[PDB]
Amino acid sequence: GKSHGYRSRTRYMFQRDFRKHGAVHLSTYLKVYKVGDIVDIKANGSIQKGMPHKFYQGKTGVVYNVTKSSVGVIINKMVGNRYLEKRLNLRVEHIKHSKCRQEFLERVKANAAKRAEAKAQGVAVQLKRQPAQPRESRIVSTEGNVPQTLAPVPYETFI
Amino acid sequence: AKSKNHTAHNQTRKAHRNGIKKPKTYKYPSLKGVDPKFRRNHKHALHGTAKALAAAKK
Amino acid sequence: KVHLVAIDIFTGKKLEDLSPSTHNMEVPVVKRNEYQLLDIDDGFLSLMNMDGDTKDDVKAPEGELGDSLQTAFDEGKDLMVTIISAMGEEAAISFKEAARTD
Amino acid sequence: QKDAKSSAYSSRFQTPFRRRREGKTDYYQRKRLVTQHKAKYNTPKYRLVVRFTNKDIICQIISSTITGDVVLAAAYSHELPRYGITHGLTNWAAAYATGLLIARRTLQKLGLDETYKGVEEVEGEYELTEAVEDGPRPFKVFLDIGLQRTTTGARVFGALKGASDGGLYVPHSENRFPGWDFETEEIDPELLRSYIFGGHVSQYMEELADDDEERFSELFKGYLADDIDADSLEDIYTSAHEAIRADPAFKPTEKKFTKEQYAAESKKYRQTKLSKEERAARVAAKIAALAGQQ
Amino acid sequence: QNPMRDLKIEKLVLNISVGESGDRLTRASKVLEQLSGQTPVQSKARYTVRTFGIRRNEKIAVHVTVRGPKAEEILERGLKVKEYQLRDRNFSATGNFGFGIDEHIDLGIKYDPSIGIFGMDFYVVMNRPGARVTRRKRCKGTVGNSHKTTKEDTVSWFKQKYDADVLDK
RNA sequence: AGCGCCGUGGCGCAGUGGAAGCGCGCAGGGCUCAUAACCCUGAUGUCCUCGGAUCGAAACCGAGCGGCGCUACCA
RNA sequence: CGGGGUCGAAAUGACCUUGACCUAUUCUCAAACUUUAAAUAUGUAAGAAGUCCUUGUUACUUAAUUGAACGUGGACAUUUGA
RNA sequence: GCUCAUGGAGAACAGAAAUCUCCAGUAGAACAAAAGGGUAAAAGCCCCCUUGAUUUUGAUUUUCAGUGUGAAUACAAACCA
RNA sequence: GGUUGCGGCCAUAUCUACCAGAAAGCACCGUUUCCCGUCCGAUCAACUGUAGUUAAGCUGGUAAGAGCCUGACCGAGUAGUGUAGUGGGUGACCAUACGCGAAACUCAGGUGCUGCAAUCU
């Protein structure tokens, strides 16, 4: 028979961890969650209530709703030829924040600081990120740094 | 007389023809699925603020 | 298709049938139960369980088994009798002596 | 031989948390207590922690953050003598008094004390600090006893009643204050008031005084020094409750010294780690002694 | 050094393992509580076997755990019936020890024909303080090996007490 | 080759998780001049082997070994 | 301390051998074992529906004009956020 | 409220295995079953009290046509433990 | 700096064997009338803080310590892997080009840090 269950092909996925079995630490509960918060999803198999599906394991979503011990999350899910909005009533043991979003907000306020300084002096912020541009010329010296000539090595069996 | 049981061949070409349109995200989304306590208070608060703004500009 | 031959058991009467190997055929939920033996009144077997002095039961199967059992009770040596409960049609089938627990 | 565990055992070993190795917390309970309805996002969950040493009581108002629990208030049997108790700094009555004290301290620093006065006229009955009308709700606080056996007739619940009388909305039930007859589910407020003002202690004093003066001298020795008796103890407890309601405002010590003087002596007396080079020296001396063939 | 690592007893315990259940076990319990002045505690099975003719949870035995001056009094009565002579084979690897005997009425009992006869297993747990440092709920800890107790120190204590000798091995 | 059944005393055949039944055979005694038959008596069963589950198996589920059976058609 | 062979009367007495168990060592392995752990594939963010400041609303929440959600007013442009 | 399997050391009958006591014991046990995850002041063992295995109907996830069935998740208003 | 309480991360924090411990604080400890629970005031409840001890717990230090953690200009740019080729080879397989890049091992280092409050020469 063919077996396709809610917790199928999930063994190593909800394997808790090595040397981290047992209970959960408390920042998982003391953290805070608001509408519009972006969150990651990894599931704690030690908490068999409020779980997500293995599809949503290791995924990312946005909050829309908040309750006693649980949080609403929106996800987009490919179904045939479209992305469908899917709403999950998850538990915070399985939730965590997205540090990408945190760092984005920090970049935002720093960009604002730059705009403030450039309102103070008119000094051409250039706020946008730019890639690792190709590098510029220079002169490398040789003092104490003579080039050692190298060449290949013969074939040794090494047994 | 057996047959071809299954294959995902050509499905992604079919999808990516006119495919994977992101869902149109909207301002002021559904307040369905939301905590009804919050729904109720949100209703009364909006009634209050509408009244207040109309009284500020009547 | 299968020819089947089985003996109706509360009567001792042969039953021959035949039917395809893949069609469904009914089975009861028969179970035998041991019971102790007390002073036999008229045909009601005077039995009991460990937690009950019950069983104004199946009325003395008339077979040679029944008569031999009557004689064994006449010479005592209590005989744990076994029955069966096929379709709620109870009947006694055999017995054994209390080799211990005299 | 048997007193040597395996490398694999010690490798695959998972520690518990620190406080659990030390036998001081139940993260089960701590979770149940500090975790909060996420609709109440940042509004904390205020515990009233109470703890019992030998020769002391502690009662604290505590909250919970991500770095550590955080404090508002405190209370101590070893500063009750400001408010007028000298002996029995771990008893039921002192527990009640500490709870009352920390309650009035909080309501002092938050102005809930004129409102939610609490209770002054005490008889020993079950009633909670029900809120005012058209006004701020009383301070909601939840008890935390750590590991101590919830059991009928304990100084922890004495402290709890002290807080509730001091004007804190702590939730509880009357089925553990002493005098709670089990089959006839009724509490005895007069017996409870006796335990408040020192009923059982005074009973012990009375019986020893009639029969066993040698134990009456061996212990209660400070009471002998102070010339105490079975009405003075009630009167001082009452006057001390009044003084607590008067000036609960936490006058601390003077400390006689400075932090870095305490630390100078402690660091002086301290030990210290044997560094890498002198570790090499240590092993080399071991070599030259023993591997030097005597 | 010896400030308060001085030795003492934690407990005596008396076990009786009746071959089966029944009035014999009840009578053994009656005997133990008649001696102790306090009620005993019965003991059920663990699993099943016919060689003894037993089953799981069938009340095979009884025991008691007692302490203090009463415990040591009962102990020295056991010793005087045992002529104050014991075995290093009987002593354990920790300092705890014991001995199994017959004829409990030797301890000075007004026998009754009902109670019958019962043999016994006395066992003795000695220690030093820190008992609750291991056996409490809070700030639990495993004692130091220095403060631990052992066969040799325990037998030395037991000999210098009573001047009562034991066997070689 | 595929599938199914069965292995219980010296023999044959029953046996249903709390723990082996019967007959014939065996042995002893007695009658008999002796053996039979006869009367009074007792005993005998790694339950095919290994492993498992079970608090515990002959039984209940795997591994193997054996004695059998059934399948084997349209060309 | 399983089997035993010997000294001998035997002795938790002595010796010898042999399967166990313990110790650390060694050779080889695992689709349904694993501490570890890639490559490739995969989710999300990279702003105007935004950021900040102020204060309006509510029967929600808070001990609390505290917080939450939605807003007023104002500011933040040319690089409005790779 | 306790901490299991197992091993070691003891205690008459009592032995390999009966009950009691001490040491270690990160789980090598147990949780109705299949297997897999999960769990050590517990979700295991014992003990106490109970009947939320209740009512109202809606939302959501899985299978998925985003139909049903089945199972589960998180809430609101009630009544209860 | 030490100690106590509530703690965050939950082994640099554990484990084993020893050594030491000013003060203060914890703790050990003393007692059973009172509420309370036990076969047993051992556990737990209550009383004194008196009788006494820092031996144990607790804190720290030692160990060419086991373990854990980190780093390596150690192994190893190896093994594996993505893409290309009318590349080689009988084939298994391999090399090359554009790219990513382990683990084990070997060696070196480290052995809890820290928040709120209170307290100690």
Return left, alpha or beta for A125; rule: phi > 0 is left, psi -120 to 50 is alpha, else beta.
alpha
Judging contacts by C-beta atoms under 8 Å, the chain B residues touching residue D39 are 35, 37-38
Distance CA E165, CA E163 (A): 6
Distance CA C20, CA E28 (A): 69
Evaluate if the CB of D153 falls below 7 Å from strand I: yes
Residue E139 contacts D where some CB pair is shorter than 8 Å: yes
Q: Which single residue is written with the structure tokens 């009798």?
A: C81
Retrieve residue C82's tokens.
């076994």
Contact criterion met (CB below 8 Å) for A26 and D31? yes
Report helix, strand or coil for E52: coil
User: Are D22 and E137 inside 8 Å of each other by CB?
Assistant: no
Rounded to the nearest 10 degrees, the angle between the axes of helix D199-210 and helix D189-196 is: 70
Resolution in A: 3.1
Distance CA D49, CA D31 (A): 14
Judging contacts by C-beta atoms under 8 Å, the chain B residues touching residue A72 are 33-34
Close Cβ partners of B22 (under 8 Å, ≥ 6 residues apart):
A76, A83
Closest CA–CA distance from residue B10 to any residue of chain D (Å): 46
CA nearest D152: which of D185, D125, D178, D181?
D178
Judging contacts by C-beta atoms under 8 Å, the chain E residues touching residue D24 are 138-139
Report helix, strand or coil for D226: helix
Q: What is the CA radius of gyration of chain C?
A: 17
Q: Which of residues 20-39 of B touch strand H (CB under 7 A)?
A: 32-33, 35-37
User: Are E139 and D24 inside 8 Å of each other by CB?
Assistant: yes
Evaluate if the CB of E36 falls below 7 Å from strand I: yes
Please indicate whether chains D and E are in contact, defined as at least 3 beta carbon pairs under 8 Å.
yes
Protein residue closest to H19, using CA and C1': E17
**Bridge-based pairing state of the strands E120-127 and E8-17:** antiparallel
Please indicate whether chains A and C are in contact, defined as at least 3 beta carbon pairs under 8 Å.
no
Q: Which single residue is written with the structure tokens 């035998």?
A: C32
CA nearest A17: which of D12, D17, D35, D26?
D12
Distances (CA, A) of D237 to D93, D193, D230, E146: 8, 11, 12, 47
Q: Output helix, strand, coil percentages for chain C, rounded to the nearest 5.
A: 10, 40, 45
Residue E141 contacts D where some CB pair is shorter than 8 Å: yes
Judging contacts by C-beta atoms under 8 Å, the chain D residues touching residue E138 are 23-24, 146-147
Contact criterion met (CB below 8 Å) for E98 and E71? no
User: Are A92 and D39 inside 8 Å of each other by CB?
Assistant: no
Q: Which single residue is written with the structure tokens 């040799």?
A: E152
Distance CA D215, CA D275 (A): 56
Distance CA E131, CA E148 (A): 11
Amino acid at D114: E
Distances (CA, A) of B49 to B45, B57, D68: 6, 12, 40
Residues 132-171 of D with CB under 8 A from E: 146-147
**Structural determination approach:** cryo-EM
Contact criterion met (CB below 8 Å) for C48 and C35? yes
Distance CA E65, CA D51 (A): 32
User: Are A65 and B29 inside 8 Å of each other by CB?
Assistant: no
Evaluate if the CB of A23 falls below 7 Å from strand H: yes
Residue of D nearest to E133 (CA): D23
Name the strands in the sheet holding D57-63, side by side, starting at the edge strand that comes first in the sequence: D70-71, D57-63, D47-52, D142-144
Report helix, strand or coil for A91: strand
b/e map A45-83, b = 16+ CB within 10 Å: beeeebbbbeebeebebbbbbbbeebbbbbbbeeeeeee
Q: Output helix, strand, coil percentages for chain A, rounded to the nearest 5.
A: 20, 20, 60
Distance CA E133, CA E138 (A): 8
Q: Which residues have Cβ atoms closer than 7 angstroms to strand F? A: C 32, 34, 82, 93-94, 96, 99; E 47-48, 50, 55-56
Amino acid at A58: G
Distance CA D222, CA A135 (A): 85
